[PDB]
Amino acid sequence: FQDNQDRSRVETNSATWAHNLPKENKFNTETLEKQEVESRILKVLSNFEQVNLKNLRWEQNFKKLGLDSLDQTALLASIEHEFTILFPDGVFEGFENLEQVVNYILKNINAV
Amino acid sequence: LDEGLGGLSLKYKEFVKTNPGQDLLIGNIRVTQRPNGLLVAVD
Amino acid sequence: MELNSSAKEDSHYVGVLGYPSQHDPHTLHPKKHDSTFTKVYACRDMLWDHHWEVRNTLYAGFKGALLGVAYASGFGLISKTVPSIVLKKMFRFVRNNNFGHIRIMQDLLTPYALTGFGLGSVYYLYQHNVWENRSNKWLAEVLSNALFFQVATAVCVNPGFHIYGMVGGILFGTLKYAFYNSSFFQEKESIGSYTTFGDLSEEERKKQEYKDYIQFLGNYHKVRNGQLVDL
Amino acid sequence: LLRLLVSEYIFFLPVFTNLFIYWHIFFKNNINLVNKKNNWDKSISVKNIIIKQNPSFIIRLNLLLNSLMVLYLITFNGYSSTFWWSHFKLNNYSLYMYLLVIIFNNYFLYITEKHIKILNNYSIDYFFSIINITLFIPMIFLSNTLFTFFFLIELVSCAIFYKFIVSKISFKNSNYKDNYFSIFSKNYLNVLFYQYWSSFFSSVMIGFCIIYLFSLTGSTEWSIINFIVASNNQINYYTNNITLLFICLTLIIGFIIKLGIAPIQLYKIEIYKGLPFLSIFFYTTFYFLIFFLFFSLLFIYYLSALNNFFWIILLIISIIGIFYIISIIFDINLFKAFLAYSTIINSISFILLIIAIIF
Amino acid sequence: MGDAVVIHLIQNVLIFGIIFWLLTWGAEYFYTVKQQLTKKQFYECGFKSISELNIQINFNFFMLAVFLILYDVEFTFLFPVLFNFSMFSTTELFLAFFFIFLILVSLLYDWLNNVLSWSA
Amino acid sequence: GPLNIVFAGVAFLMFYENNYKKLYLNPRYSYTMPYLQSAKITKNLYEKL
Amino acid sequence: LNIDGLHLKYNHNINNVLYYTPSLVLFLIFFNIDYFSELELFLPLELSFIDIYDDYYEGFNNSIMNDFTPLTLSYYSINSAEFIIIGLLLLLGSVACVNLYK
Amino acid sequence: SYSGYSLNGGVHPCLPFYERMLQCAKSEALPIKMCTAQTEDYLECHHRKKQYALNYAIKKELNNIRIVALPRYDEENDTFVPFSQ
Amino acid sequence: MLTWISFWSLIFWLILIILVLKPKNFISILFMSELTWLALYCLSLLFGAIYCDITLLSISFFILGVAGLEFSFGILIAILYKNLNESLNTDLNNNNNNQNIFDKNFKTPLEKINWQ
Amino acid sequence: EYLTKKTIDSFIFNNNRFNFINLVESKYFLQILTLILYLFFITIFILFYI
Amino acid sequence: VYQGFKVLRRNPTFYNPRSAGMVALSYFAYSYYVNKYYKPQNSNFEEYNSSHPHNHDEKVRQYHEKTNQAIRDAVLEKRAEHDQRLREEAK
Amino acid sequence: LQMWGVGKIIEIKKFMKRRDIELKGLQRKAAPFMQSMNDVRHLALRERNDMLYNELLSVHGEEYAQKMQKRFHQTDIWAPFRHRYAYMYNSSNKNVKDYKQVTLSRYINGFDKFNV
To answer: L56 and H53: CB-CB below 8 Å?
Structure first.
């Protein structure tokens, strides 16, 4: 009998040495979780000591957090180095708050 | 074993020094000489 | 290259020709005036007795276990995937043990050797006790092998593939009858050979052979039908 | 050496003449552009410097020379014997195989010459490689020892590698979307890689078999090997069944790897995938006429004294091959794979026929 | 070729190297080396090097090595007839001349196809 | 240890047995053991050294 | 092609414990194609005498002064066909190498 | 591929055996069953199996205490004197 | 401690086994193939000496020639690997997951999968 | 329908479940080595114990 | 400047001594297995030319030798008789 | 100059050939006595081995010993047993001494017995 609900074959084997817990499939398209991105961004934001992280709400513009244009560029480049990605020119200049950055990093599959 | 084999050869020399053509008798084996000149232990 | 050469011997032809017989008594008989050690050593003829049921069963199990070990070594283990955690634990065990590879090999090859031993022993006991007295040898081989292989496929492999096990058993039985029971490509005689036993002189045999040739001439279609032109 | 008999090397004269004519014409064609215009010379027209030779004449040349070889056979005379230190055999069957391969090559070349005028997608070096192959394979038929057969087979394998190398890679098509982007084909590399490594494996195992045949018999001549093996069977002198079994097994497996037969048929699929249709045409005729026929004659004629060891091995392989391909041939989706599997299935059938014959 | 004396002489060579090593070690008593920043760094005409491991050549002359591999075999096959040329006959002379002619023809083909130079 | 002592004894007996059978119970016509065999000049083909 | 020694990060343990160790063990157990041959210590050396025999009549009838005689015999007398074949093979290989470069 | 040459350009030691085997084979109507002796001699020349069997038997016999001393040979004359004297 | 005939037969087959065993890098396989040819060279010389046969020394030098031509082909094929977008480690030329490699990881050349 | 056609169909499909449509180099070398070693093993096993 | 210490300090004896000792043990065991059990068993020299053989192969070889000797003797005798008859009836 | 030099080299070679003819004649004069001594010593060793083998093998029957000592059906061809065949130095031995004597006789006196 041929079971069409079973679609596994030798092509779909997804056992890797590095991962002790095997992954769901062989597509390496796993994105980061929301809390991980926020925690790493907060770690990056610690260097900019004019920003208070205690009751930081992410929908505020960069200016109201205490960052001017140069500090905005430095912070965006720091996050960009942190996740080992690049922001396209339109995406880099279109960022207004940390929520948009969080969403963009969430949608990215190359972020590590 | 080679010490034993060497001992048999040297004792047969002094045996034939006094008994030429006889058979040396020690233990349970007999040392005899063949007409071609070979010394063999037979038991 | 011979298979089952001992069971296919023509004893009468071998005895007439003087050829050594594979059914001759290959036994050791200790005699008196001998030491007590050679009495014990001469008992090794037990392992040479092919009529010993326990020895035959153990030999069949050994052959099955060896085949299973070979299959695991060549095709079984490499196809299966081992979890990374288990492999890491195994390699760590090798690091902390002088001969840790042998233990890993034992753990990996024990199931296959055990299954082969059981299959060989059960197959020998099933063939020697049930199907050894059936008149139709080919049919007996086919049926026994088909049933045994269907059961083996159901047990060792998924039970949903038992039909393919039956088909494989039928094919294996046919092959076994063709080459393990019969003697093709492995013949100890010549086709058409015979042995004479009577007291007939050469003249009587020659007369009988002339009669046989006259009869044999009727096997030609042209001769029998009278379709030959004048030469 | 007090006298060099003509009967030792009479057969080689037409082959040497054909080789010299072929290579001289090739070398002269290599410089077909160089033509000095002196200061006192006048040109009726302006010379065109971008040219693309049509290889048709080259193919024609091949046909002509090949046809002449046919003539040399038709008027052939001599004795049934050996020549060049018993390294080559001259008898009726070998010469008939020679004639058969020549005439089939000539027919294939004629059809190729007809086809080449529709569309020129092949170079002169391609048909020069074809020339060399068609010049050298019937001498593989004329072999008398495993040594000379091995050397001839490496010569022809190098010619086949040369043919595979000169396959056209880039084409002028109507796909204008691929400019300013990199597209990777990888078919050329796979063909070269698999042909190279299959040749390596077959060659090393054949050399191994040659070494042990010298050890066991003292020569690689077919008649001496067969006589020694049969006499040893009668005498019961050399009773090492393991060595004979291993020699037969090594030779058979080497030929299995060389021919890409059902246990090892996979790389032939890649080779066919990476090859043009004309290459598959010529390769199929070369494979069936020469390689498989010699593989058959090994068990039938050349090493018949070892059939009592051969048959079982062949049997096993046959069974495995069938049970390996009765399902794999049903999950292919390529024309080249279809052609290659057709060849593989027919090879298995012919192997079964060989097993029937040797009984 | 040689004999068992060669290994012993190699060991003697190693002992002589030990003598040089002792002299060089003894010479260390007459100077000092002061640790500095760029002293143990790569020297590139007085400035700092920009690469350490990835220093790759183009190797745009591999055809020369390819041909060398073949012509070494050619010459090693040529040695025996030269060594025993005093016993030549028709066959030996013809074979030697044909082999040399084949070598020359191969070299001529290489020259014609211009694979004996540097390529971009 | 005791087993080390046994090994040393066996090794010494092996060494002495080899040397004894080389020095005696062996024809001495070629120079093999220096400073124990004669280093003279021999005029005949078979002279004991 | 590999300027630095950096290579593929491969683990040899998995294949060793899955395939190669048992296959090697079985091959070693069952493979032996040496029918009869003895070590030099199988029998006392004093029982051999053929290395001492010398035949002086072909000693003064032998004019050979090098060790190339068997190679010369085979390459230019007996296996000269294979010598020519290897020469043609090298020529064809050079042509194929040039075409591969192109 | 049998050349009849030795390793120094001389004559292969098994050449007469090969020659006699071929002469027998080319003259008999049933060469396989009528040239057994010549082929056996050639095979013994090539594979020295009988000598190896003899060596095995001799080692097995020498493993015992059969032999004590051997006669001595004096170079002057082709005579063996016993070890006793 | 082993007879030379059995030793050299085993050495040849072990060389083949090790050639198969090692990771599929083209240069490594080329080197191991050269070693295989040299083992055949040694075995042929040994049997030529044992059986007083002059053709096996010819096999030695013919092995030298064949191995040289094969090495030239291998060098050219590796340089061909350069021009095509292929890795000298063939295991990196496919997406079949391999547990023997620590760091095998390939994904599609896309920045993101979903937009809405 | 099933016992005549779909048994063979499903057998072929399930067998192809374990087949790589594209040959890789390691699989090629492993297949050659396995063929050599285990053809030798099966022949020697038939010679000795069968 | 041989510099023995700077050259031999990193790898004095063996990179992995444990693995080197596993090669030696395997080599020793395999040599013993080949020389003491497998090769003597395959050579079958134990009962060679024995007057009372027990192995089947030795009996088969002895039968082959005896049969070939008998065939040669019978053929030679018949050939001698036939040649003598032809010579005597030629004169 | 090339032609003249080749002719000169041929001249010296022919002169050496004449001297070689003379030396070959002298060696022929010397040969028979060397051959006689060699054969006598070889036969002495062979007789020793024959008597040893007969004594060892006579314990298993007189017919067994002659069956074990029999090699060839035809007795008019001499093919003495050899484990191997020598090839180097025109199938000869240059060093007929132990390895210690090989490595010490090149430096230390008292190792060569000065054949005069």
So the answer is: no
Any CB–CB contact under 8 A between H45 and chain D?
A: no
Buried b / exposed e along K31-66 (16+ C-beta atoms within 10 A): beebbeebbeebbbbebbbbeebeeeebbbbbebbe
Whose CA is closest to K76, among K87, K88, K68?
K68
CB pairs below 8 Å between G and L: how many? 44
**Strand-pair partners of D90:** D81
CA I34 to CA G92: how far, in whole Å? 21
Residue with tokens 């040694």: I42
CA triplet D285, D290, D296: central angle to 5 degrees? 120
* E56 Cα to chain K: minimum distance (Å): 27
Chain D residues with CB-CB distance to I12 below 8 A? 208
Place of tokens 């016992």: J3
Q: How far apart are CA D228 and CA D172, in angstroms?
A: 61
Distance CA E62, CA A37 (A): 51
Q: Which amino acid is at F14?
A: M
Q: Is E56 left (phi over 0), alpha (psi -120 to 50) or beta?
A: beta
Q: Which H or E run includes D112?
A: helix D92-116
Neighbouring residues of H52: CB distance < 8 A, sequence distance ≥ 6: G36, G37, G38, K43, K45
User: Which of the residues A8, A20, A23, A26 would you substitute to probe the C interface, choosing the one with the greatest number of C C-beta atoms within 10 Å?
Assistant: A20
CA dihedral H16, H21, H26, H27 (to 10 degrees): 100
Alpha helices (H) in E31-89, listed in sequence order: 62-83
How far apart CA D186 and CA D164 sit, in angstroms, is 14
The tokens for C134 are 């059936």
**G-I interface: how many C-beta pairs under 8 angstroms?**
89
I54: β partners: none
Short-list D122, D120, D113, D200, CA closest to D163: D122
Q: Which residue of G has its CA nearest to C91?
A: G13
For an interface test with I, give the residue of E58, E60, E63, E69 to mutate (most I CBs within 10 A). E69
CB contact at 8 A, I21 and G20: yes
CB within 8 Å: H3 and I51: no
Cβ neighbors of E23 (< 8 A, separation 6 or more) are none
CA-to-CA separations, J35 to D265, G15, J41, in angstroms, rounded: 12, 17, 10
The response to whether C12 counts as a known ligand-binding position is: yes
Residue given tokens 């039909």 in the structure block? C163
**Exposed, middle or buried: residue D345 (CB in 10 Å: 0-12, 13-18, 19+)?**
middle
In sequence order, the 6+-apart residues with CB closer than 8 A to the CB of C118 are C61, C64
Residues D246 and D257: their CA atoms lie apart, in Å, by 16
Written as six digits, the tokens of C68 are 């299973």
Is there a contact between D250 and D201 (Cβ–Cβ < 8 Å)?
Answer: no
Query: Are A79 and A48 a contacting pair, CB within 8 Å?
Result: no
d(CA G74, CA I55): 6
Do D308 and C186 make contact, defined as CB atoms within 8 angstroms? yes
Angle at the Cα of I106 (from I105 to I112), degrees rounded to 5? 120
- Distance, CA of I44 to CA of G74 (rounded, Å): 15
Which of D153, D158, D143, D127 shows the shortest CA–CA distance to D65? D127
- Residue D239 CB partners (closer than 8 Å, separation 6+): K44, K57, K61
User: Using an 8 Å Cβ cutoff, are L71 and H72 in contact?
Assistant: no
Residue in this structure with the two tokens 């079994």, named with its chain if needed: D245
CB contact, 8 Å: L47 with chain B?
no
Contact D223, D288 (CB under 8 A): no
Set of chain G residues whose Cβ sits within 8 Å of the Cβ of L81? 50
Q: Give the chain I residue nearest K28 (alpha carbons).
A: I1
Alpha carbons within 13 A on the beta-carbon side of G41: 4
The three-class DSSP label of residue B30 is strand
